[PDB]
């Protein structure tokens, strides 16, 4: 049984030649900047780490957190498929209290890595490889909280926006080679979203579909206008940084590739959806939502998870990649003029998506800890 | 003027590495067969390559009769764009003769070659690189010859079974190391073609509409099915082989990658002329089916000449080219309800895949011959 699924979770030719592998050995972590309430959630973050017992791992710590989130988002999507019914106050609530749970055992494991002697590129690789993950879940469980399903154009956007500014902040730590913080970011975001969990728990739908008096625009529109804010603000940043901070040969990437090479690979997941969408005969999106977003979301979160390690191989990025044969088999459906109901075939779209996406992230951590001989959730 | 023309004929990468360039050194040419008629035309081709003078090169013997393949097929094409009119008989003889002398001029390069001590792999490659985009033109021409535009079904299936073959003749070679002719082989169906064009000068129209009595199916559909019988025969030969003779470990190819990789090459190329076929709105095939076989023809030869590079450099084959951007154009607005006019976008995929294919050719004969340091088309 062991044998058997090992064989299912590994590509058959290793993703990483020896030279990026020893190349990998060779990276050093470089951030440089401060969020405008991380001070002030600094001095919880130290204290909660020295409470932390000194034999948890790192990679133990985000995967804890990620599994929490995970759980009471698909238990938030199994209760609202469509995004347009109405929960139990207590599962916004298991969402608020599981996302301030990730948020915590995230923003430790670094610190606990270094207070351990424990850090290591299999660590950095892990956790930006499970933000991506989370990330997905976060979007779509704010879109579920707000009801934005009635709405299918600006639940588009803003989800689709999201990641995209994930994406981003990669291509830019892709680029110039640091993370680069912004006044605004994850901290603001995310404590943004556990206080909105809330009044959808306070005032339930009555709230949401309430009338703003001076833009005769509905409330729940505020969030998603909120979201073409911030995307503004953030790519603002990013794409400064993108034209004028790249530190390889004549104002390359620290790769030697185009500045735009990864523009290609997020754009082409943007438009894949996109076409998708507008080209759907049994509107797919509005009836099922959240399965959509599913879908796709792992097919972007491969994509960023293929940036950080393109970012930590310091290699150049091919757009051939097997994420994309799931939505190709949604594209190729909708060609034909849909002779498979395209439900069935978004939930087989969805499941290889997952498995496909398992299979890598299993395969390159496996392969990193093989070569620096160290076990991924157990410290020696 | 030079400078720009240069730079927009080669890839800005070169497309084989140094490794792959050593061990095409390495290549020696093998083959094993006889067909039925070649010793009958040997005589022939041995008395004439004596005539021609040693200082010319042999990729310049090959590219004249390229050349008058190409103008006397295009010329046709001109003449009779939906293969429904009738030409004048001279064009026809212009094709009969045209490819005659393309048949004369091919058959005794590589004897030249070995005459005047210039073989080469440049040679080796430009040969069958030629004759990769000259089998295009003879399927078409044949097509044109016998009015098969009347029956589009049965001219897409021969046309594209034509150029299956031929790929599946280097897929052979790729398996086995060695060019294996048939008993049925090029000698024999060139001059089958050849005698075809004359009764199609004698008796035009009236004759190839004539009925068979015992069948009762057109006689025009005779050659259609001989096209069927010949693949059968091929096919056969080639797969016996392709499943047995497998020289590198395991019983792999001689490059050590899976005997059905080059299927999925071949395939997606018949796939998507089937699907843009029959999904096709403004029935784009049938009113303009020359264009749209030179379109794809030009895709299949490229695919064809990265199968002999793939042998000659010993790797292997990625699925991923830009061949397929052409089709994708195509398909892409075929899925957007022909938003463009299909026979517009058909003459820009057309402009693109033969502007591609030029380029690829080019740059990587420049590369072999500046490796080599010889020219492509003088002798020392
Ligand atoms: C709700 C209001 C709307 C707009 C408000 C303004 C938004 C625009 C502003 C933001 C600009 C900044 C870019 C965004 C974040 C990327 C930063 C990054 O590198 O990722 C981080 C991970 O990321 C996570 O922790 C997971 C993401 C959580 C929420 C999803 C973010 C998408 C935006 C959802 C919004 C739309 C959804 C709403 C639905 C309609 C980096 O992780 P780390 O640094 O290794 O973690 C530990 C270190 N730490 C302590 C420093 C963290
Ligand atoms: C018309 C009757 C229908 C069917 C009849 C039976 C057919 C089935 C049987 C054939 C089985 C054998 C496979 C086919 C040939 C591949 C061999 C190869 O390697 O290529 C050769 C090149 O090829 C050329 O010279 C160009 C091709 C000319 C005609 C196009 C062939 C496609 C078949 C069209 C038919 C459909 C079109 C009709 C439209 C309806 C190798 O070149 P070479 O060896 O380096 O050249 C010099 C050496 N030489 C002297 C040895 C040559
Ligand atoms: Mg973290
Ligand atoms: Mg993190
Ligand atoms: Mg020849
Ligand atoms: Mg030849």
Known sequence: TGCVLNKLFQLPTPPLSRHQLKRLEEHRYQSAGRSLLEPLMQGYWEWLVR?????????????????????????????????????????????????????????????????????????????????SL?????????????????????????????????????????????????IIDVTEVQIFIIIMHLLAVIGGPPFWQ?????????????????????????????????????????????????????????????????????????????????????????????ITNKLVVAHMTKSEMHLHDTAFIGPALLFLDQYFNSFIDEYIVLWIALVFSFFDLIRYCVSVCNQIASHLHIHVFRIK
Chains 1, 2 share one sequence.
């Open 51 to 131: 409470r932390v017992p000194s034999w948890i791992a790192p990679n133990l710590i985000t995967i804890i957190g990620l599994s929490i989130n995970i759980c009471t988002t698909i238990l938030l999507v199994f209760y609202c498929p469509t995004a347009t019914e109405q929960a139990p106050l207590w599962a916004y609530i298991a969402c608020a209290c599981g996302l301030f749970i990730y948020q915590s055992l995230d923003a430790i494991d670094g610190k606990q890595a270094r207070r351990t002697n424990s850090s290591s590129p299999l660590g950095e690789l892990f956790d930006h490889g499970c933000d």
């Open 134 to 182: 989370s990330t997905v879940f976060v979007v779509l469980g704010t879109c579920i909280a707000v009801q934005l399903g009635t709405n299918p154009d600006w639940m588009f956007f803003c989800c689709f926006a999201g990641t995209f500014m994930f994406y981003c902040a990669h291509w830019q730590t892709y680029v110039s080679g640091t993370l680069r913080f912004g």
């Open 210 to 302: 309430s009338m703003i008096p001076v833009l005769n625009i509905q409330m729940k529109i505020f969030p998603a206008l909120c979201t073409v804010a911030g995307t503004i603000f953030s790519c603002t940043n990013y794409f400064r940084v993108i034209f004028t901070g790249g530190v390889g040969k004549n104002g390359s990437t620290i790769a030697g590739t185009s500045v735009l090479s990864p523009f290609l690979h997020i754009g082409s997941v943007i438009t894949l959806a996109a076409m998708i969408y507008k080209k759907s005969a049994v509107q797919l999106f509005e009836k099922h939502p959240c399965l959509y977003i599913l879908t796709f979301g792992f097919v972007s979160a491969k």
